[PDB]
């Protein structure tokens, strides 16, 4: 289950019981899809009518295949921003090449690979002058084919985002093509039973890029996240301004510590990015390429905030800011100066009118929290 505790001195919330799922490295698997099977093609031309019209695709992406190779690649001369943004230099190995493994990769007989060779290794998956460039249609007896409606999307995914696909599609890496490709990942059998059961939260977290087109086949690279540490004790702090002391002045304070922390090693690694941490149920998916580390003498900061022991990361002011801050379970409220704050339910809009100070309200106690005329609705959702 999930627990939360409120610290009246720091006016902050600390929510515990999240089992962290942490990304460590990346499994890179290269699918290069060839054209086929076009082998059900008639022998004869006509300017009669159906389809093809997947030509403009094999151009449109071949077009921007140079755009990245020019506007980016040549012109090259916080997670995940840099990470896959940098992990392109995995492709500078893959592309700007000859085939490398290309044909010798899959060959016969498997569509799979054991290892991709290279300056480094990789997966190789797959499916399907005087070249094509074919022009025709003829009406004889028509069936579903010449759209496997699989590649056709791959471009609109690649082109609309300019070669870098923000997440892994169903048709970019097939459900079982992604499932099996999990089975080969370098950690354990523990994270597998999860990463398979969690599969969608991989794809949201993935990156993908186009190795090549040519005419030969369309070669793209799917990078996947891999989580090394499956179940770990991680927890999240939420803060609001703790102000005090009215003789007609105000002495105020704020925690700068939030919101996330986890410790695998253990060493306690803290995740300051508003992004980089996401919740599904109990589990918390965080990006290990974020940081930093701090000591396990961080812990103290919760208990006495004024500790000479490990001076805590805070903020001072004679300036109070009346504001609201939401928790995984309840919500914190700080009403200061001349302002007016209250709560409410779905069946009554104003139930209690809150004191001026820091005050904590669980989701049994209220739903609405009215701030001076912005309503915060009390979520089940975290920071």
């Amino acid at each position: 289950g999930l627990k939360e505790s409120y610290l009246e001195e720091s006016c902050s919330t600390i929510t515990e019981g999240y089992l962290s799922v942490l990304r460590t490295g990346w499994y890179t698997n290269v699918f290069t899809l060839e054209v086929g099977d076009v082998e059900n093609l008639t022998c004869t031309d006509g300017p009669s009518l159906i389809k093809t019209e997947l030509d403009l695709t094999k151009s449109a992406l071949r077009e921007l295949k140079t755009v990245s190779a020019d506007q980016l690649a040549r012109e090259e001369q916080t997670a995940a921003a840099v990470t896959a943004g940098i992990a392109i230099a995995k492709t500078i190995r893959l592309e700007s090449e000859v085939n490398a493994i290309k044909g010798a990769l899959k060959t016969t007989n498997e569509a799979v690979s054991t290892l991709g060779n290279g300056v480094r290794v990789l997966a190789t998956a797959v499916r399907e002058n005087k070249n094509k460039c074919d022009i025709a249609d003829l009406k004889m007896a028509v069936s579903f084919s010449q759209f496997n409606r699989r590649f056709l999307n791959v471009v609109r995914q690649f082109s609309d985002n300019a070669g870098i696909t923000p997440a892994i599609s169903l048709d970019l890496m097939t459900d079982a093509e992604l499932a099996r490709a999990v089975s080969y990942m370098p950690t354990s059998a523990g994270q597998i039973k999860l990463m398979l059961e969690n599969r969608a939260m991989v794809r949201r977290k993935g990156f993908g890029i186009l190795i090549g087109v040519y005419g030969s086949s369309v070669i793209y690279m799917v990078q996947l996240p891999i989580f090394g540490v499956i179940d770990t004790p991680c927890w999240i702090i939420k803060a609001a301004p703790s102000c005090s002391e009215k003789d007609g002045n105000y002495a105020c304070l704020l925690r700068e510590d939030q919101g996330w922390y986890c410790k695998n090693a253990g060493s306690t690694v803290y995740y300051p990015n508003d992004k980089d941490c996401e919740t599904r149920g109990d589990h918390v998916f965080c990006d290990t390429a974020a940081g930093i580390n701090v000591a396990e003498q961080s812990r103290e900061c919760n208990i006495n905030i004024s500790t000479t022991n490990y001076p805590c990361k805070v903020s001072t002011g004679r300036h109070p800011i009346s504001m609201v801050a939401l928790s995984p379970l309840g919500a914190l409220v700080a009403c200061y100066k001349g302002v007016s704050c209250s709560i409410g339910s779905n069946r009554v809009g104003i139930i209690k009118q809150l004191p001026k100070g820091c005050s904590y309200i669980t989701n049994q106690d209220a739903d609405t929290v009215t701030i001076d005329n912005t309503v915060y609705q009390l979520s089940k959702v975290e920071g």
Partner: antibody
């Protein structure tokens, strides 16, 4: 093997003062969160204080400005000094360790020790 | 605020599982613990974070805590289990027990 022993109070006359001790074997003290829990014989348990190992300390309402909870951290002893002692305070006094969980927050009482009766009486 | 409250009396038929409730304020979902103390003994810790038994405690024990209320459940119910049982949790930064629950194993 990990265990605690509390150093007796005995008998203290009301308006009293006295000072207990717990010293433990098998673990440090400033290492861990620890606290004092008293029980008047036949009745139920009452937490009377806790020591957070940063030096920071909280007391149960029923004794405040009376009891002070300390550490030698040399003899590896834990002290509870009791003042202006009153009849109601008569009880066993257990010392027991408080687990650290994962973050800083306190969790459970893992091990105790037999505890040593104060009787407060004139 | 916190004060816990648990019933001072419980009975059980031998071998038939039975169990005791400790409920206060918001245990939702607050970290519990569970103590067994036979007469004249120090009390020993039967279950802590919750429904989690520490090393070398019989697994016929286990906990449940959700919402208002936490409940300690004994599957086997052998007469050696007859005792006082206490539960505790944390608040502000300070602890709380409530002292109620003896058991019985009849007849």
């Amino acid at each position: 093997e990990v265990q605690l022993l509390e150093s007796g109070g005995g008998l203290v006359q009301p308006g009293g003062s006295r000072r207990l001790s717990c010293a433990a074997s098998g673990f440090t003290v400033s290492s861990s969160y620890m606290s004092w829990v008293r029980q008047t014989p036949g009745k139920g348990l009452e937490w009377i204080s806790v020591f957070y190992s940063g030096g920071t300390t909280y007391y149960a309402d029923a004794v405040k400005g009376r009891f002070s909870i300390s550490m030698d951290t040399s003899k590896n002893t834990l002290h509870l000094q009791m003042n202006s002692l009153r009849v109601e305070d008569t009880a066993i006094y257990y010392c027991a360790r408080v687990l650290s969980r994962a973050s800083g927050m306190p969790d459970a009482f893992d091990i105790w020790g037999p505890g040593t009766m104060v009787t407060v009486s004139s | 605020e916190l004060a816990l409250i648990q019933p001072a009396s419980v009975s059980v038929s031998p071998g038939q599982t039975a169990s005791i409730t400790c409920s206060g304020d918001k245990l939702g979902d607050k970290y519990a613990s569970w103590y067994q103390q036979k007469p004249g003994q120090s009390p020993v810790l039967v279950i802590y974070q919750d429904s989690e038994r520490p090393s070398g405690i019989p697994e016929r024990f286990s906990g449940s805590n959700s919402g208002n209320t936490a409940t300690l459940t004994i599957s086997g119910t052998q007469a050696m289990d007859e005792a006082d049982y206490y539960c505790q949790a944390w608040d502000s930064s300070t602890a709380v027990f409530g002292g109620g629950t003896t058991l019985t194993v009849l007849g």
